[PDB]
Amino acid sequence: YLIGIQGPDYVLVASDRVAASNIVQMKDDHDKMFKMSEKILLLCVGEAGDTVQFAEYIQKNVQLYKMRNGYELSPTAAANFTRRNLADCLRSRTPYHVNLLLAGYDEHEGPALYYMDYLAALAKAPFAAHGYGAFLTLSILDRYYTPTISRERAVELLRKCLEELQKRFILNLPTFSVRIIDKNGIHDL
Amino acid sequence: TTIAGVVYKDGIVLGADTRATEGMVVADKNCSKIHFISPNIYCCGAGTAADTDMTTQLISSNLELHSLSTGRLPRVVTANRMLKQMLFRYQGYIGAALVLGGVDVTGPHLYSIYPHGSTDKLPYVTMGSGSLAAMAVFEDKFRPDMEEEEAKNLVSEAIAAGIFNDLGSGSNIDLCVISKNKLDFLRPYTVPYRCEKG
Amino acid sequence: NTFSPEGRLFQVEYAIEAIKLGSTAIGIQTSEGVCLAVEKRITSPLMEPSSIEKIVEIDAHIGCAMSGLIADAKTLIDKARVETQNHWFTYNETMTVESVTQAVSNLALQFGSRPFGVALLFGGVDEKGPQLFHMDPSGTFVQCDARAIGSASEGAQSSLQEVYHKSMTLKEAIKSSLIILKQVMEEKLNATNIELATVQPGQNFHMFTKEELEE
Amino acid sequence: YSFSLTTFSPSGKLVQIEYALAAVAGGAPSVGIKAANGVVLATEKKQKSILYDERSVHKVEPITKHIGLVYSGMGPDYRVLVHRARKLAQQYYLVYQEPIPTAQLVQRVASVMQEYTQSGGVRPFGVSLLICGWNEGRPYLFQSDPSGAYFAWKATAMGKNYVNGKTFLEKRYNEDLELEDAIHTAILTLKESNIEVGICNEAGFRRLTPTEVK
Amino acid sequence: RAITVFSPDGHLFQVEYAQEAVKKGSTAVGVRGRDIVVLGVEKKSVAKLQCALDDNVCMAFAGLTADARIVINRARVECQSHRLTVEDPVTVEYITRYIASLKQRYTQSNGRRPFGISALIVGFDGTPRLYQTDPSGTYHAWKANAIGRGAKSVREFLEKNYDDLTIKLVIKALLEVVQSGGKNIELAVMRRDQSLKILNPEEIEKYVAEIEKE
Amino acid sequence: DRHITIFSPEGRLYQVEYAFKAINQGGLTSVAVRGKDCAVIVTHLFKITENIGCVMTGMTADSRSQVQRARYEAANWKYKYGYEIPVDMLCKRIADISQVYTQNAEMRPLGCCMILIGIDGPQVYKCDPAGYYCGFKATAAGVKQTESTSFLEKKQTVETAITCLSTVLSIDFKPSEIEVGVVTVENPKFRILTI
Amino acid sequence: TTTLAFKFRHGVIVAADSRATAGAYIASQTVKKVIEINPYLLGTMAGGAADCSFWERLLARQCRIYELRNKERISVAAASKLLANMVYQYKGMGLSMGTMICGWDGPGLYYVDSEGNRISGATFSVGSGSVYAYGVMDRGYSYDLEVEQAYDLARRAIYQATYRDAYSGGAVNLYHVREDGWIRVSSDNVAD
Amino acid sequence: DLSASTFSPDGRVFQVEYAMKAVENSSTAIGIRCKDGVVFGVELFNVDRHVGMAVAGLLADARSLADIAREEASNFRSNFGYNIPLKHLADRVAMYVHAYTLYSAVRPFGCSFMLGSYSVNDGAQLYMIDPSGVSYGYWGCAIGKARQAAKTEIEKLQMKEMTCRDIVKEVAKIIYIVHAFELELSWVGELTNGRHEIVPKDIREEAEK
Amino acid sequence: NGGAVMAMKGKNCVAIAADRRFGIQAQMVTTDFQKIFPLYIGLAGLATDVQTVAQRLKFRLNLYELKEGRQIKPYTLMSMVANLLYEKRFGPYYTEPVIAGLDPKTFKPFICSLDDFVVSGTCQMYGMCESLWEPNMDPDHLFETISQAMLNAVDRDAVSGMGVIVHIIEKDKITT
Amino acid sequence: SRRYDSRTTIFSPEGRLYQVEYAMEAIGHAGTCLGILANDGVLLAAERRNIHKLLDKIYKLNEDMACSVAGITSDANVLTNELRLIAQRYLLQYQEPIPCEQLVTALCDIKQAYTQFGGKRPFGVSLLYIGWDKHYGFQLYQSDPSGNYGGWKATCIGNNSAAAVSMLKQDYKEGEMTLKSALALAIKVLNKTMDVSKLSAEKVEIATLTRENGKTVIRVLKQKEVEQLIKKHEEEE
């Protein structure tokens, strides 16, 4: 499960720290954070190596660009880049099954997060979620969220969504790796 | 989807209906099917309209390149032979079939060409969804020794037999004469509340 | 490509001339142990005294000294390591020095674009005990007892001719290289003017620390 | 081979292309005029042995519905260049479905002639050819040359004694002239230096019909 | 065709020519400062109308820059590819090895010529490492080295003399021996984990003026 | 220079004209006449297609490569179109591949003049190692080719050709020396006359 | 095919049962699952028997080519990563295994599934019996653990796994990767 | 002039001629078309069971053309069934011989070789292939060193009604006059039933006698 | 997934309209998802193909638009996407493009679709608009008919709706 | 065979490639051209190769970037084609218009490959890039006919590049230009470089790159405006 919120001067994203094959989870420290730049941050739910075999394959390009050009890409620019890859893999022998949120904060275009379908259906998202806990949570966030908010309030709005994943949902996802992106750049919470 | 052709004394009257359906809905009530491969030769299409249009464009560019090169207007059999091959090579991925008619000094030829690549010249041919219904009328009524103008009275009724009796085929008949004497296109040929502003 | 009217190829004999501008290297074989030795080949003082290298490992049992065109050597060296590990992967035994050298000889004159200038000295103690195969850039490997490769090496060859001993002791054989390297060199040899590497019958190949070299 | 036979001279001149321009200097004269009814292109061809044919290999070969070419230079080279020009035109028709703009066919064909001034093992095309076309509201008269440089013209000349032929074309003619009237300058500029002729107008590309050439 | 076929000398033609080509490059001074690396280049030839491969590895090529970027691009693809395969970033040594292998490759090749650059690859491990790489594909560690036009005389200037002080060395070599240029010189200290960082010319005046006092 | 097909400073390919001189030094003297109703050729007679023949003239070895290429293309025509390739189309295509020898410096002009005869009425095409082809009315190619061309210009068809070879090579023949091929209106089948 | 591993302040212990099977027939009970790559880091074998040998032969080869060329040790992070990459390529080919990289670096334990699931935890059990092995494991596991107490924990947790898993029988095979590196700490029997 | 693609100004490629000289050196082969059969003699290769070959010019290269001819006979037998006719085989192998002349990189052949075959329809056929790829039928062929020198004695013979049976001795006789001589002889005529085969040793010993 | 693509031509003004939503299965993702990319085009069907064809087409189109500053003819654009999608007849991308917009400088409308009005998409529309179409409408009217057809076909439809965008192309104004 | 090959990738004993030196000299045969940056826009004057009566160089790389091609025409077209492709491929996947500095590096990679390997002749054509990349605003780059590129505030290329660019050394004051000063200096230097005292409208054509109301637009000057600048020139004389 992944969650994303767009705020006045921030982008808020947060992730369950878990993975499981079989009946048990085999880790609870699992980072569905895939930070790739100072303010370009993938978050990839999806099964197996494909989530990270893709994530890093994007990361090294997004980084390769920064050395080769001397400047950092826009959240949109990185988004359309990963979008392109996923569309190519759909027709390929290997169609990756990665549902990801590309958070980012451009300065002069402002904060933006993007939902990205595994098939490859980029869309700018005012707020978004991924996973299967997405069916539950998106209603809470759709009701509650307004145009204004604050990073202080964003914490409460997100803490309320955490309740759904334990209290009504079957799977136990117990710790949430909350993080923000703000003009300052990324911080853990 | 009733396309047809007849070899009359001076040539070939091709005939076609203006309908294309995406299954059970008519998406085009004015569909052009008697595609101009060349000024001399024309090819009706049936089956999938996409395959028919595009394959006809390929043979068009091909035929018009060969005639452009010799400076002599191409033969019908040539058109057919590359069509035979073109519809064979895919082995049923080109599932759209073609009725080619043309005249070369050698005179009229009209081959129905099935999408697996069988080319068979015959005095009457029909194809499309309506073909069974159409071919019974072409069988019953076609006569060798038919004249030039009576073919207009022989394909408009035959195609009409496919317009009424069939449900894939309908709409205005197209009829395109092929003769060295003259060529004729008759694009729409034979015809058989306000949402108040502000 | 052109066999000269006098038989032998041109580029190869020119590659043999390229060795003459390569470091002197004694390739001692004691029947106890292997003692590959090479002049540091350092000339520049702010060029590092411990980062320059002349002799590389191939397996844990085979060392490999090099001479001639130093840059060219590393291609054949890396491919030798790939060959030996491939042998380990397929047969679980380590690849003996005769075949480790042979595999590198096979690649030597494959120019259908230009020949390597490198002379190599594989030393590996293999079940036979000590073995020391010199490798010419002519694609010819030869088993040796004492061969010194490189530029002042011809004088090192003839010097070796009197002092070569039946059998030999490991430490005494080492001392032979330590003395001969003073002769072949223009300067007075210093432990930072040699890089010695030795393989005792029982040990895995060791680059020799400098303090031991002064003695 | 894999190595180009085009290399700079010490001051940066493409010697083989310059020699290709010398090959253009040979060949029978060509002439072409944009008049205002339509362009005309015409060329000297000769009986030579009196056993020849005149309808066998016209220098005036239609390329597309309303484009044509006339060459000066080597005749053998023209036969294949035309083939690729027709290839580009028909390929364009199946992709874009309109007969390709005159300016574009000239550009694409120029690129073909440029490829060999950079491509291995091949010499540059000797042939230089007028490429005359009429789309939309305008008659187009183009000159492609051996390096793949091309220019649109209002009047131009090629082959033997183009040097004087162009001079006549700028003084004996200017502005506009009704198509046979601008053929007047063709037949009389060509005279300075059998004959094939072909015209464009807006009547499908056309070879000036033989009874009326007379 | 084999390009770098051996001479009857035993030398390689293209390689020695490439050695003289870097000598035409500018005086890419470097030294492995005990604190931190510092490197710099000179002779920008200011008309007034006018690298980093990682956050550890950095490069100060001399030679012909036309080739040098083209080398560094492939080197940068190699850095990032290594970071995805081993978890940690590439070490300066591994970069130096690849660039040296890459440069070697073109001598033993069909149709290629050695890259004319001799790069001063530099970088933290947090201990400074200051390699030279030369067209041959030889790579040597150094603690001071300077490759360029008149850089050899600078290396000797260093040999007899070998944050402010390492910068004083890098300036001193140039503002005593090479032409005095307050803009031509572009030294960039790389701090331990701060990315190679150039200074504004006024910040360079820490010694560019203090050398005028010395 | 004069070795790799490239242009001379006169804008002239040297290797091409060397190939023409090689045709002249092939030592044979072919002539063909286009009658209204028949198309005599005389000299190496070939049957490129059952309806088409030609005589190569020049290097002997060189003739066979282009004979086989002519049969390849002639057969491939019918395979993609389904009617005899016209004599014009066949000569055009073989000329188009002989240019490839000229465009490419790798490979060399095959020195064989190619006098095609066949009815598309009767056709007498020439082809050169240049890549130039044209329909003549009464061609000749070979050694005494120019001396024959005059006699052709001055000008029963079989007689024209045979008296032309007789007068022009200035020799009275034996029937084995003059191989003769006719393609009569009624006989589109390439056929050696057999005087 | 159980192969527990866990790390604690005085080592990383890797225990493995020795049974291997085809059908409900048991071909052997002699295999030592913890295929060696390096004196100081080691593999595992779970899933199909041949896969783990082969992949870890390729791993041992590549780790060796690396240690020669780079002239340094390959790390547990890097070792698992090259491994994870190499097993990914054969994802969808059924080359299934549950190899683990272990070794002192601090200690590094990275479980590495065949579908490319290179995850770093500290506490693992891999294989069929893992679900049994897990429940015992957590109950004694603390980072505050003596080398002996940890030996007992690895042996109890393997012993309770083999007791229920039909396809896992054979003797416990501890390897302890302490600071220095691994030793065959116990090979001791289960039929005690 | 020295490279094959180039033409010398006069009208030939001199490389091809230098390659031709190689067979002008090597000693005479002599096949003789006869009332039945072609007795190859060379002071032999089973190209096919049907076809025999007698090479001349440097032997190294000659074997490769032999092997290509064996390949050519086999591809023809497979694709068409029926045993290859020599009039087509000559033309095919000769075509392959011709390709070299045309491109700079590969060198022209040194060899010239008379393949021959008795067959029912064709009867005896004796075709010689030059390194230019010029193959012609013959009534007799003799190539090598004594090139016209052998030709005067095969001219002295008048096989047209000589039997193969005289010729098996006569080839060796012509060899002896133009020629110590190692002798080789072959019989391909209807008694041998088109099986390419060396002369029976007693007749071959008699032939040298 | 999908989405609806209204398109309609009455008088020189060229109407086109579309739903602004797409769904991951039956759950709406976004209430804003562009389908009408500016002579305009409106693709519907899969989102992956919507975006893939929009990208590929703008690319091929810009190479032309730089090569001649001559604006593209609608018919040639129709051929451009026609050929572009038929290249996958073995792996065909699922999206239904319906261009709508003027023929340059003659102010002449050309609408068409590709496998009066042309509707396409997941939809409801073809039966709804057909007898309501007037062959002459001022944009003021044109907006009204297309907005009715849009809203009525799509409010009923399950998987489309929740936002409407309407471009009524004219040289004088382009209303939204 | 390869005996002919003159290499044209060789490295010379003087240490400077042959074709690169010859490529520099090809441009001297090329006609005058100059681009002049300002703080609001970037000019590109160029001189139409001859005035010839009966004939009836700057191109659109993007709408936000454009190039001037100097050294030769036949090669230039292929360069422009590749530039349009690189730019529109970058616009394809990254979905933002290519930053101009990058577009230059890409074409110069393509150029450099011709010198480095393959035994093929290099493109001999120096280019300018006028543009306004997002990250730097207006910028101008010059591409040497071997890989190089140099961001330049004003530069000339073509015949008398040296006299013209040197004339701009002191006659282009730094960081003061309103676009008006760019037109004045442009018209000056192009005036001084030709032996014709002033220049005719069939000589100059000026593609000014101007940020047109938040949508950057390249525009070749309309000839009536070209002649007001020239008509001003006649009185500047």
Short structural description:
By secondary structure, chain B is an alpha+beta fold. Helices cover 31% and strands 32% of the residues of chain B.
Q: Your description of this structure?
A:
The structure is cut from a larger assembly and holds ten protein chains of ten kinds. With 189 residues, chain A is α+β, with helices and mostly antiparallel strands. Chain A has one domain (1-189): Aminohydrolase, N-terminal nucleophile (Ntn) domain (Glutamine Phosphoribosylpyrophosphate, subunit 1, domain 1, 4-Layer Sandwich). In chain A, 33% of the residues lie in helices and 29% in strands. Chain G is of the alpha+beta class and 192 residues long. Chain G is built from four helices and twelve strands. Chain G has helices spanning 49-69, 76-88, 130-140, 147-162; strands at 5-8, 11-14, 20-22, 25-28, 36-38, 41-42, 98-104, 107-113, 118-119, 123-124, 174-177, 182-186. In chain G, a hairpin with a 4-residue loop joins strand 8 (107-113) and strand 9 (118-119). In chain G, helix 1 crosses helix 2. Chain G is globular, with a radius of gyration of 15 Å. The two termini of chain G are 20 Å apart. Chain H has 209 residues and is an alpha+beta fold. Chain H has a single domain, classed as Glutamine Phosphoribosylpyrophosphate, subunit 1, domain 1. The radius of gyration of chain H is 17 Å and the shape is globular. Chain H has helices at residues 14-25, 59-80, 86-99, 151-156, 164-178, 201-208, and strands at 29-33, 38-42, 45-46, 51-56, 112-117, 125-129, 135-137, 140-143, 186-187, 197-198. In chain J, strand 5 and strand 6 (137-143) form a beta hairpin. Chain J is α+β, with helices and mostly antiparallel strands and 237 residues long. In chain J, the strands form two sheets. Chain J has a five-stranded antiparallel beta sheet with strand order 8-1-2-9-10. Chain J contains six helices and ten strands, in the order H-E-E-E-E-H-H-E-E-E-E-H-H-E-E-H. The interface between D and F is medium-sized, with 31 and 34 residues. Chain G: Belongs to the peptidase T1B family. Chain G: GO terms for molecular function: endopeptidase activity; peptidase activity; threonine-type endopeptidase activity. Chain G: Keywords: Cytoplasm, Host-virus interaction, Hydrolase, Nucleus, Protease, Proteasome, Threonine protease, Zymogen. Chain G: It comes from Homo sapiens. Chain G: The active site is at 1 (nucleophile).
Overview features:
part of a larger assembly, 10 chains, E: 214 residues, alpha+beta, Glutamine Phosphoribosylpyrophosphate, subunit 1, domain 1, four-stranded antiparallel β-sheet, I: 176 residues, 32% helix, globular, hydrolase, proteasome, 20S
Q: Roughly how many Å apart are the termini of chain B?
A: 42 Å
Rg result of chain B: 17 Å
Question: What is the CATH level 1 assignment of chain B?
Answer: Alpha Beta
**What share of the residues of chain B lie within helices?**
25-40%
CATH class of chain D: Alpha Beta
Number of separate strands of chain B: 12
The quaternary state of the protein chains shown equals part of a larger assembly
Helix count, DSSP H or I runs of 4 or more residues of chain D: 6
CATH topology of chain D: Glutamine Phosphoribosylpyrophosphate, subunit 1, domain 1
| CATH architecture descriptor name of chain B | 4-Layer Sandwich
Q: Major sheet of chain B: size, sense and barrel closure?
A: 5 strands, antiparallel
What is the percentage of strand-forming residues of chain B?
A: 25-35%
PDB class: hydrolase
Keywords: hydrolase, proteasome, 20S, adaahx3L3VS, ligand, inhibitor, drug design
Entry title: Cryo-EM reveals the conformation of a substrate analogue in the human 20S proteasome core
Chain A: proteasome subunit beta type-2
